[PDB]
Amino acid sequence: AKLVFFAEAEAFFVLK
Amino acid sequence: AKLVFFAEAEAFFVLK
Amino acid sequence: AKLVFFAEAEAFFVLK
Amino acid sequence: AKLVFFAEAEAFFVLK
Amino acid sequence: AKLVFFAEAEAFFVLK
Amino acid sequence: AKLVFFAEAEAFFVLK
Amino acid sequence: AKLVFFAEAEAFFVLK
Amino acid sequence: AKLVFFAEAEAFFVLK
Amino acid sequence: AKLVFFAEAEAFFVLK
Amino acid sequence: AKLVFFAEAEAFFVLK
Amino acid sequence: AKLVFFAEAEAFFVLK
Amino acid sequence: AKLVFFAEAEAFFVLK
Amino acid sequence: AKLVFFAEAEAFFVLK
Amino acid sequence: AKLVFFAEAEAFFVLK
Amino acid sequence: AKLVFFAEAEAFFVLK
Amino acid sequence: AKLVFFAEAEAFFVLK
Amino acid sequence: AKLVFFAEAEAFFVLK
Amino acid sequence: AKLVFFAEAEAFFVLK
Amino acid sequence: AKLVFFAEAEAFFVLK
Amino acid sequence: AKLVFFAEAEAFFVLK
Amino acid sequence: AKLVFFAEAEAFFVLK
Amino acid sequence: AKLVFFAEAEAFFVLK
Amino acid sequence: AKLVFFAEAEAFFVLK
Amino acid sequence: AKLVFFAEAEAFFVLK
Amino acid sequence: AKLVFFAEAEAFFVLK
Amino acid sequence: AKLVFFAEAEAFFVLK
Amino acid sequence: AKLVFFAEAEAFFVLK
Amino acid sequence: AKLVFFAEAEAFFVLK
Amino acid sequence: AKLVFFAEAEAFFVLK
Amino acid sequence: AKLVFFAEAEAFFVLK
Amino acid sequence: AKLVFFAEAEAFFVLK
Amino acid sequence: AKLVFFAEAEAFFVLK
Amino acid sequence: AKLVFFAEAEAFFVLK
Amino acid sequence: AKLVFFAEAEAFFVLK
Amino acid sequence: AKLVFFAEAEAFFVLK
Amino acid sequence: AKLVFFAEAEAFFVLK
Amino acid sequence: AKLVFFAEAEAFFVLK
Amino acid sequence: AKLVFFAEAEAFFVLK
Amino acid sequence: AKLVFFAEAEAFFVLK
Amino acid sequence: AKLVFFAEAEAFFVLK
Amino acid sequence: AKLVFFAEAEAFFVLK
Amino acid sequence: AKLVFFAEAEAFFVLK
Amino acid sequence: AKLVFFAEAEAFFVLK
Amino acid sequence: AKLVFFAEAEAFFVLK
Amino acid sequence: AKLVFFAEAEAFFVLK
Amino acid sequence: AKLVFFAEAEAFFVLK
Amino acid sequence: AKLVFFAEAEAFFVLK
Amino acid sequence: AKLVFFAEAEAFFVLK
Amino acid sequence: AKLVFFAEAEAFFVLK
Amino acid sequence: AKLVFFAEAEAFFVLK
Amino acid sequence: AKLVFFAEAEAFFVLK
Amino acid sequence: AKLVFFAEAEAFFVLK
Amino acid sequence: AKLVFFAEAEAFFVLK
Amino acid sequence: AKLVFFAEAEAFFVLK
Amino acid sequence: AKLVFFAEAEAFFVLK
Amino acid sequence: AKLVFFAEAEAFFVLK
Amino acid sequence: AKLVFFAEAEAFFVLK
Amino acid sequence: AKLVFFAEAEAFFVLK
Amino acid sequence: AKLVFFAEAEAFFVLK
Amino acid sequence: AKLVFFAEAEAFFVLK
Amino acid sequence: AKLVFFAEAEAFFVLK
Amino acid sequence: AKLVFFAEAEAFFVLK
Amino acid sequence: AKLVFFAEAEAFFVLK
Amino acid sequence: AKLVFFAEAEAFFVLK
Amino acid sequence: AKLVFFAEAEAFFVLK
Incomplete structure (x- = not known):
């Protein structure tokens, strides 16, 4: 998860 | 990053 | 959170 | 402790 | 310091 | 070190 | 990377 | 003081 | 920041 | 003075 | 073990 | 540090 | 406390 | 090569 | 030394 | 990386 | 010739 | 501080 | 550190 | 006494 | 260390 | 004269 | 003195 | 006073 | 002991 | 551990 | 190493 | 005296 | 290797 | 002292 | 000054 | 007193 | 200051 | 000195 | 001087 | 050593 | 103890 | 010839 | 090793 | 010092 | 005194 | 120490 | 005397 | 003369 | 001073 | 050792 | 000298 | 000074 | 007086 | 002359 | 006479 | 090679 | 000179 | 001519 | 002079 | 003195 | 001394 | 000639 | 000395 | 006295 | 002479 | 002299 | 003595 | 040609 | 003189 x-x-910095 | x-x-829950 | x-x-960048 | x-x-330097 | x-x-218990 | x-x-065990 | x-x-930080 | x-x-830090 | x-x-990124 | x-x-102060 | x-x-230095 | x-x-408590 | x-x-840095 | x-x-590596 | x-x-029982 | x-x-190559 | x-x-190349 | x-x-004085 | x-x-101190 | x-x-040099 | x-x-390695 | x-x-003084 | x-x-100290 | x-x-700055 | x-x-030299 | x-x-480097 | x-x-549990 | x-x-230089 | x-x-150590 | x-x-050690 | x-x-007493 | x-x-510089 | x-x-009643 | x-x-007694 | x-x-008993 | x-x-206890 | x-x-190094 | x-x-060889 | x-x-070879 | x-x-009342 | x-x-530094 | x-x-003295 | x-x-060289 | x-x-002194 | x-x-004089 | x-x-000692 | x-x-009874 | x-x-009175 | x-x-600075 | x-x-004087 | x-x-160089 | x-x-040739 | x-x-007699 | x-x-004069 | x-x-002359 | x-x-003379 | x-x-003397 | x-x-003189 | x-x-009184 | x-x-250094 | x-x-003297 | x-x-002469 | x-x-003489 | x-x-001449 | x-x-001549 990243x-x-x-x-x-x-x-955007998306953290999924 | 992870x-x-x-x-x-x-x-430690670490990003980098 | 942060x-x-x-x-x-x-x-380290730490996630809390 | 640290x-x-x-x-x-x-x-800040924090004492924990 | 204090x-x-x-x-x-x-x-925050802070030194400085 | 640790x-x-x-x-x-x-x-994994890693030596840091 | 520094x-x-x-x-x-x-x-304030600078990250490269 | 910096x-x-x-x-x-x-x-590594430098404190002056 | 920038x-x-x-x-x-x-x-490659620069973050200021 | 200034x-x-x-x-x-x-x-930090300067006094002239 | 190594x-x-x-x-x-x-x-990484991995110790398995 | 500690x-x-x-x-x-x-x-005494000493900061090392 | 200092x-x-x-x-x-x-x-020594003594913290009393 | 080297x-x-x-x-x-x-x-980070250099290959010559 | 002590x-x-x-x-x-x-x-740590330390000499120095 | 170049x-x-x-x-x-x-x-002959150089890789950095 | 190089x-x-x-x-x-x-x-990108340069040929001379 | 000087x-x-x-x-x-x-x-006349200058204090910094 | 130094x-x-x-x-x-x-x-006035410097810490390296 | 020291x-x-x-x-x-x-x-300060303190003489106690 | 480095x-x-x-x-x-x-x-062959160097560790500083 | 200064x-x-x-x-x-x-x-410390300088007198000229 | 300094x-x-x-x-x-x-x-270790130097006094000038 | 002064x-x-x-x-x-x-x-020194002296208070009189 | 040692x-x-x-x-x-x-x-440190440690006594055990 | 260390x-x-x-x-x-x-x-020796010892693992404890 | 082992x-x-x-x-x-x-x-002695030794690395080398 | 001084x-x-x-x-x-x-x-002023004052004589006391 | 030294x-x-x-x-x-x-x-501080240097290992070669 | 080093x-x-x-x-x-x-x-082997050298202590000065 | 005064x-x-x-x-x-x-x-209040103020330094002017 | 300060x-x-x-x-x-x-x-204001207040001297209490 | 004090x-x-x-x-x-x-x-000497001194400020600084 | 004094x-x-x-x-x-x-x-405190201080050596100046 | 006088x-x-x-x-x-x-x-003020002044020299100059 | 011992x-x-x-x-x-x-x-006496002696360090050898 | 020393x-x-x-x-x-x-x-002799005596440890009393 | 060597x-x-x-x-x-x-x-890598050198032939002369 | 060379x-x-x-x-x-x-x-004739030399191996080190 | 003592x-x-x-x-x-x-x-002789000596410091050192 | 001095x-x-x-x-x-x-x-020697002597205290008088 | 000299x-x-x-x-x-x-x-004027220098103490090291 | 000395x-x-x-x-x-x-x-100064002082005669006592 | 120094x-x-x-x-x-x-x-030990040297006088010239 | 000098x-x-x-x-x-x-x-004309200089005093340092 | 020596x-x-x-x-x-x-x-002041040297230990080899 | 005198x-x-x-x-x-x-x-001070001084020679020089 | 004195x-x-x-x-x-x-x-004579001399200013030192 | 001078x-x-x-x-x-x-x-000498003589003050007569 | 000067x-x-x-x-x-x-x-000590210089005369040119 | 001097x-x-x-x-x-x-x-002045005065010759009395 | 060269x-x-x-x-x-x-x-006569050299080959590198 | 004169x-x-x-x-x-x-x-006064002065040497010029 | 000057x-x-x-x-x-x-x-001291300069004549040209 | 020169x-x-x-x-x-x-x-044409110069006199220094 | 020369x-x-x-x-x-x-x-022309130089006197030191 | 010498x-x-x-x-x-x-x-002119030297004293060692 | 000098x-x-x-x-x-x-x-002592040197004449050239 | 004496x-x-x-x-x-x-x-005679002699300084030794 | 000299x-x-x-x-x-x-x-001899004679002090008369 | 010297x-x-x-x-x-x-x-003991040398005369040159 | 020489x-x-x-x-x-x-x-042309030199006289030493 | 020679x-x-x-x-x-x-x-010219040399006397020792 | 010179x-x-x-x-x-x-x-004495040099001819080139 | 040359x-x-x-x-x-x-x-062309140069005479000194």
């Missing part, structure tokens, strides 16, 4: 960076503008 | 668990007691 | 920086040497 | 460095900004 | 206590809850 | 139980699933 | 944490308490 | 904490985890 | 992500695949 | 007080907690 | 070095970046 | 009970009579 | 530096050689 | 692996955890 | 006792647990 | 491949055929 | 191929994957 | 006292009597 | 205490009364 | 160095900044 | 692992197969 | 008195208390 | 106290425990 | 600067070396 | 050298950083 | 350095001559 | 056991009594 | 430096601006 | 352990207590 | 412990296990 | 009785009720 | 700085604008 | 009294005689 | 009676409560 | 007397009360 | 009971009357 | 050096030839 | 073959496996 | 093979065929 | 008294007569 | 340096060879 | 006293009377 | 060296800065 | 007094107490 | 008197009649 | 004790009072 | 007497009290 | 009675006959 | 400088070597 | 008189008491 | 140096600026 | 052929007829 | 009669009362 | 006469009395 | 006469007839 | 007289008649 | 007296009239 | 006359009185 | 009565008639 | 050096071999 | 007088009492 | 006469007619 | 007289008339 | 004729009469 | 005559005929 912190990943998403970007689409805006960005 | 959530890891370690311990010798003290427990 | 990701914090702990250090004592060694350092 | 004096540690915590940071999250602000930082 | 051992101080503060809190908003979280409690 | 022989620690570590997990990231999969667990 | 962290420099400044403090004076107020703290 | 703290610089280096890290790569292994950590 | 994130700068470099990519060419390979990715 | 007082300049710096603070970041830590406080 | 201390071995793994690397993949990050490295 | 707050230790120390004796050499006379006993 | 961390003080003693020196006499050897030195 | 491998040099640096580690401090974090690992 | 035989001293300290402990955070582990106990 | 590759330089030299050639004149004979070839 | 080739240098850079890469990071993205690649 | 005092410079100028004089020619007329006197 | 302590250097300056005094002229006024005292 | 000259000891105290520091807390300021320093 | 690990440098040399390899050409044959492997 | 006096500069330094202090940190310990004091 | 005191410089070195400590690593062990303490 | 806070004055006295020096003779050593210096 | 005075031995232990180290783990810090070192 | 890997420590013991010496008394002969030396 | 965890070995030896003893003449004292028991 | 020639001293007084300051409060104005400064 | 170990040098420095100490002054604070300790 | 200790150098050599080892290859066989160990 | 330690003055001051009132604005409430009275 | 000189403290107050600020609320206007500032 | 009003302190000292004397070897001459008496 | 062994002085000093007070800041609490009194 | 010993001069002046006064507005305070009396 | 703390031994020794006699030559008179007995 | 390790002291005696010499009279022969020498 | 060959020197180096090896550590990786091998 | 091999040098000489030749002129007649051959 | 205040010691000795005498062969002349009396 | 700590002074006396010498006549031998030297 | 004292050098310079003089020309005016005197 | 010519001795006194120092406290200033130094 | 005096250097060495000490470690035992003392 | 006096340097310049003369060409006209005289 | 002890060399230096004394001039002050004592 | 035997001189001076005094501010302390009396 | 106005002293001085004699070497002939007597 | 501070004058005499020189003849040695120098 | 006179430079040095004094620290002791006096 | 050449003496006076200074008060201006300087 | 060929260097020398000729003046007579020919 | 021995001159000089007056500014008061007369 | 004369510059310097003086401080001592005098 | 004469420099230039000639090319035309003549 | 005289150097230059001449070419015009003469 | 006296060396130089003379050329002028006399 | 004369240098040394003196300390004893005198 | 002022001694000495005779070899004729008597 | 310390003078006599020499005739043997030497 | 006199060098040695003394340790005993006196 | 004469050296150079000639090539033209003659 | 004389060497050189001559060429000009004469 | 001639340099030296003279002091005696003469 | 002549250098250059030529290439065209001629």
Whole structure:
């Protein structure tokens, strides 16, 4: 379980 | 990055 | 809750 | 027990 | 230096 | 230094 | 990959 | 009076 | 803080 | 004379 | 039973 | 680092 | 309650 | 070729 | 030199 | 993390 | 007559 | 923390 | 770590 | 009866 | 501490 | 004809 | 005069 | 009454 | 019984 | 638990 | 490296 | 008796 | 393959 | 006052 | 400079 | 008994 | 800062 | 130099 | 230089 | 090394 | 309780 | 006419 | 651990 | 350091 | 009173 | 631990 | 009687 | 004309 | 302190 | 091992 | 050289 | 500094 | 009444 | 010509 | 009968 | 590998 | 150079 | 054609 | 003084 | 104390 | 101690 | 053509 | 050192 | 009254 | 000529 | 003194 | 005690 | 093609 | 006094 960076503008560090 | 668990007691839930 | 920086040497971001 | 460095900004040596 | 206590809850026993 | 139980699933003893 | 944490308490980090 | 904490985890500080 | 992500695949970030 | 007080907690003054 | 070095970046001394 | 009970009579807590 | 530096050689941070 | 692996955890290699 | 006792647990009967 | 491949055929690389 | 191929994957060469 | 006292009597100081 | 205490009364330390 | 160095900044040689 | 692992197969390390 | 008195208390002057 | 106290425990001073 | 600067070396602000 | 050298950083001659 | 350095001559890293 | 056991009594669980 | 430096601006060497 | 352990207590080793 | 412990296990120290 | 009785009720000694 | 700085604008050095 | 009294005689009521 | 009676409560002989 | 007397009360026996 | 009971009357513990 | 050096030839470290 | 073959496996020769 | 093979065929090696 | 008294007569109250 | 340096060879800081 | 006293009377020492 | 060296800065050979 | 007094107490001077 | 008197009649001094 | 004790009072040893 | 007497009290019978 | 009675006959007040 | 400088070597500030 | 008189008491001149 | 140096600026070699 | 052929007829090569 | 009669009362022979 | 006469009395000219 | 006469007839001098 | 007289008649001396 | 007296009239000594 | 006359009185010249 | 009565008639005080 | 050096071999510092 | 007088009492001279 | 006469007619001398 | 007289008339001696 | 004729009469040339 | 005559005929001299 993992912190990943998403970007689409805006960005997020998502922790799933 | 990844959530890891370690311990010798003290427990560390660590990101890196 | 919170990701914090702990250090004592060694350092980690710890999730609490 | 232990004096540690915590940071999250602000930082302190904390006694636990 | 001095051992101080503060809190908003979280409690910090702080040296500095 | 310290022989620690570590997990990231999969667990190992690691020498830190 | 390298962290420099400044403090004076107020703290600021640079992570590369 | 000023703290610089280096890290790569292994950590080292300089306090002046 | 201020994130700068470099990519060419390979990715490298600076966080200030 | 002219007082300049710096603070970041830590406080430092210049008096001219 | 044996201390071995793994690397993949990050490295570990694993004691199996 | 560590707050230790120390004796050499006379006993003190010392920060090591 | 207070961390003080003693020196006499050897030195100590004593926390009384 | 000639491998040099640096580690401090974090690992980085040079291959010549 | 002096035989001293300290402990955070582990106990050290130390000469120096 | 960066590759330089030299050639004149004979070839040699440096990988960092 | 000499080739240098850079890469990071993205690649670029200089041929003289 | 440092005092410079100028004089020619007329006197002026800078305290930092 | 390495302590250097300056005094002229006024005292100032460097800790490395 | 003894000259000891105290520091807390300021320093003192105390003769108790 | 600081690990440098040399390899050409044959492997040799320096630990500082 | 000009006096500069330094202090940190310990004091030193230069008179020209 | 100017005191410089070195400590690593062990303490050593220079007085100028 | 008055806070004055006295020096003779050593210096102090003295309250008279 | 025995005075031995232990180290783990810090070192002491320990009496066991 | 801990890997420590013991010496008394002969030396070993001992696991306790 | 290998965890070995030896003893003449004292028991040593040794790495090397 | 003593020639001293007084300051409060104005400064004088005063004979007391 | 050779170990040098420095100490002054604070300790540091170099292993080659 | 300074200790150098050599080892290859066989160990030898120099203490000054 | 001058330690003055001051009132604005409430009275204080203030250094002007 | 103590000189403290107050600020609320206007500032005061209050000597209580 | 603090009003302190000292004397070897001459008496100094000192601020600093 | 001078062994002085000093007070800041609490009194001590200090070597200045 | 000359010993001069002046006064507005305070009396100053001044050299310069 | 070894703390031994020794006699030559008179007995002492001696470190050999 | 204390390790002291005696010499009279022969020498002893006596631990009383 | 003379060959020197180096090896550590990786091998390299010089032929003159 | 290093091999040098000489030749002129007649051959001779040195292995360290 | 310690205040010691000795005498062969002349009396010395000595620090060191 | 005073700590002074006396010498006549031998030297001592003497308290008078 | 070593004292050098310079003089020309005016005197200055260095103590290490 | 005796010519001795006194120092406290200033130094003199004093006849007592 | 210049005096250097060495000490470690035992003392030796050079006068030129 | 250190006096340097310049003369060409006209005289001017520096005192350090 | 080989002890060399230096004394001039002050004592300092080398142990090989 | 000459035997001189001076005094501010302390009396110095000085040679130089 | 000090106005002293001085004699070497002939007597004078000298400022030292 | 006057501070004058005499020189003849040695120098004096004479206050007649 | 140009006179430079040095004094620290002791006096020494240069005449150019 | 004697050449003496006076200074008060201006300087004189007076031959009385 | 790297060929260097020398000729003046007579020919001689180095191969690295 | 010249021995001159000089007056500014008061007369002196001065060497110019 | 131009004369510059310097003086401080001592005098020097440059004539061009 | 120092004469420099230039000639090319035309003549021009510098006198220092 | 040393005289150097230059001449070419015009003469100049340096006296130290 | 060891006296060396130089003379050329002028006399100068070294005392070791 | 140039004369240098040394003196300390004893005198010596060099004439070129 | 010592002022001694000495005779070899004729008597003198000699500094030894 | 005066310390003078006599020499005739043997030497004396005579204090008449 | 140049006199060098040695003394340790005993006196011996060299005259050049 | 020592004469050296150079000639090539033209003659030039050195006298030491 | 020994004389060497050189001559060429000009004469020079060395006496020891 | 170049001639340099030296003279002091005696003469010498270099022709290139 | 020295002549250098250059030529290439065209001629130029320098006479010193």
